[PDB]
Design an enzyme around this catalytic site. Structure first.
Site, PDB file in Angstrom:
ATOM      1  N   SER A  26       4.262   0.409  -0.628  1.00 18.99           N
ATOM      2  CA  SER A  26       4.231   1.165   0.616  1.00 18.99           C
ATOM      3  C   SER A  26       4.965   2.502   0.511  1.00 18.99           C
ATOM      4  CB  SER A  26       4.855   0.323   1.719  1.00 18.99           C
ATOM      5  OG  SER A  26       4.159  -0.898   1.933  1.00 18.99           O
ATOM      6  N   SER A 104       4.613  -4.707  -4.373  1.00 16.72           N
ATOM      7  CA  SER A 104       4.889  -4.792  -2.948  1.00 16.72           C
ATOM      8  C   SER A 104       3.589  -4.944  -2.151  1.00 16.72           C
ATOM      9  CB  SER A 104       5.680  -3.528  -2.594  1.00 16.72           C
ATOM     10  OG  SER A 104       6.290  -3.669  -1.319  1.00 16.72           O
ATOM     11  N   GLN A 105       3.202  -4.065  -1.216  1.00 14.79           N
ATOM     12  CA  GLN A 105       1.924  -4.201  -0.495  1.00 14.79           C
ATOM     13  C   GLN A 105       0.776  -4.169  -1.509  1.00 14.79           C
ATOM     14  OE1 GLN A 105      -0.865  -2.050   2.814  1.00 14.79           O
ATOM     15  NE2 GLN A 105       1.294  -1.418   2.855  1.00 14.79           N
ATOM     16  N   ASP A 159      15.353 -10.307  -3.451  1.00 13.29           N
ATOM     17  CA  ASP A 159      14.253  -9.517  -2.927  1.00 13.29           C
ATOM     18  C   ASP A 159      13.590 -10.454  -1.918  1.00 13.29           C
ATOM     19  OD1 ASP A 159      11.976  -8.085  -2.273  1.00 13.29           O
ATOM     20  OD2 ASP A 159      11.239  -7.859  -4.257  1.00 13.29           O
ATOM     21  N   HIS A 172      14.444  -5.112  -4.040  1.00 17.25           N
ATOM     22  CA  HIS A 172      13.019  -4.779  -3.960  1.00 17.25           C
ATOM     23  C   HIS A 172      12.725  -3.471  -4.669  1.00 17.25           C
ATOM     24  CE1 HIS A 172       8.967  -5.233  -2.451  1.00 17.25           C
ATOM     25  NE2 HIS A 172       9.024  -4.075  -1.865  1.00 17.25           N
TER      26      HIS A 172
END
EC number: 3.1.1.74
Length: 197
Positions: A26, A104-105, A159, A172
Site C-alpha cells: 500500500s 502487504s496488500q 508484524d 511490517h
C-alpha cells in the site's frame, strides 16, 4: 528501478525463459515499490537480463491502503489487472516458467489472483513469495488451490498483519533483508527445480 513493464513491452518473438509478476504494498511507488527492485536485480544476476522479464502490477492496482479492509484484502479491479498480466504471459510466451510475489496488500492480491486463476496457468507458477501477508492467519499460511511446497511466506514476529490485524507496526516495514537474499534464493531454486540448470 521502481517501474518495470518487461512483459508488456517485451517482444513475443524473443520471449524470456522466466517471467516474474510482482504486486507492491500500500501507498508504494511505481509498480514494484520498495522490495521489488531488490528481488529483480538478483533474478537478473541468476538468469541474465535477457533471461527474465520483470513485470509489476500497475494499471488499475492503485495500492490504496483502505482496500486492505475489503473481503479479499484488495479490490476486484486490482485482481482483474493481475489476471490480465498472467493471461498476457501465457499468450505471449507459453513456454516461459512463471514466478510471482507480493508485499502487504500486494501479497493478498497475489493470493486472491492465484486462487482464481485457471489451473493451466496457475500450475505454470513455479514459486511464489509473500512478504507481510495480510491473509496469513485466515488462509493458514497458504495460497488457496496452490501447493505449499511452491509457497514461501515471510512474516516477521510482531508484524500484526500476519496475525489477523490490519495495524501497521515497525516489523511490517522490515522485509528488506529477505527481499535481498532468501526470497530471490527460493524463486531461483524453484525455477531450476523444473527447468534444470
Amino acid at each position: 528501478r521502481t517501474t518495470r513493464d518487461d512483459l508488456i513491452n517485451g517482444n513475443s518473438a524473443s520471449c524470456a525463459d522466466v517471467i516474474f509478476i510482482y504486486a507492491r504494498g500500500s501507498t508504494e511507488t511505481g509498480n514494484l515499490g520498495t522490495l521489488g527492485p531488490s528481488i529483480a536485480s538478483n533474478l537478473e544476476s541468476a538468469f541474465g537480463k535477457d533471461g527474465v522479464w520483470i513485470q509489476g502490477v500497475g494499471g488499475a492496482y492503485r495500492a490504496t491502503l483502505g482496500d486492505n479492509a475489503l473481503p479479499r484484502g484488495t479490490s476486484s479491479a486490482a485482481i482483474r489487472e493481475m489476471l490480465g498480466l498472467f493471461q498476457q504471459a501465457n499468450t505471449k510466451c507459453p513456454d516461459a516458467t512463471l514466478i510471482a510475489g507480493g508485499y502487504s496488500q500486494g501479497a493478498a492480491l497475489a493470493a486472491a489472483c492465484i486462487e482464481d486463476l485457471d489451473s493451466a496457468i496457475r500450475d505454470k507458477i513455479a514459486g511464489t513469495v509473500l512478504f507481510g501477508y495480510t491473509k496469513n492467519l485466515q488462509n493458514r499460511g497458504r495460497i488457496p488451490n496452490y501447493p505449499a511446497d511452491r509457497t514461501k511466506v515471510f512474516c516477521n514476529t510482531g508484524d500484526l498483519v500476519c496475525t489477523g490485524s490490519l495495524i501497521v507496526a515497525a516489523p511490517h516495514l522490515a522485509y528488506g533483508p529477505d527481499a535481498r537474499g532468501p526470497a530471490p534464493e527460493f524463486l531461483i531454486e524453484k525455477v531450476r527445480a523444473v527447468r534444470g540448470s
